[PDB]
Amino acid sequence: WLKALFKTAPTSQGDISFSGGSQGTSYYASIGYFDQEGMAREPANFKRYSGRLNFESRINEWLKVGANLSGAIANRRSADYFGKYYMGSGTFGVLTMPR
């Protein structure tokens, strides 16, 4: 019953990021990927597709402007039966189901 309700699951992430700049101006940009699948067989996951751009620039001896911009497309799902006692689910299931 452990194998019935729990699995080995994968986590995958990758990322590239261009940093530099030179003068009074500076840039830090990155795109990235993340996907963590939940080991409970009751489905649950958190995957995100990421981007960020940070920017700062001295314009003159009085002014300095800057932005940091970030966003993402994200998919989350959660095992909503956990922490309750339902016959054949969760770690309670894996202990209480007659073999």
């Binding site: 922490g83 309750k84 006692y85 339902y86 016959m87 054949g88 209480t96």
Partner: peptide, 10 residues
């Protein structure tokens, strides 16, 4: 099918 038995709540 839930087993209330006793749910000492959190």
């Amino acid at each position: 099918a839930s087993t209330t038995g006793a749910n000492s709540q959190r």
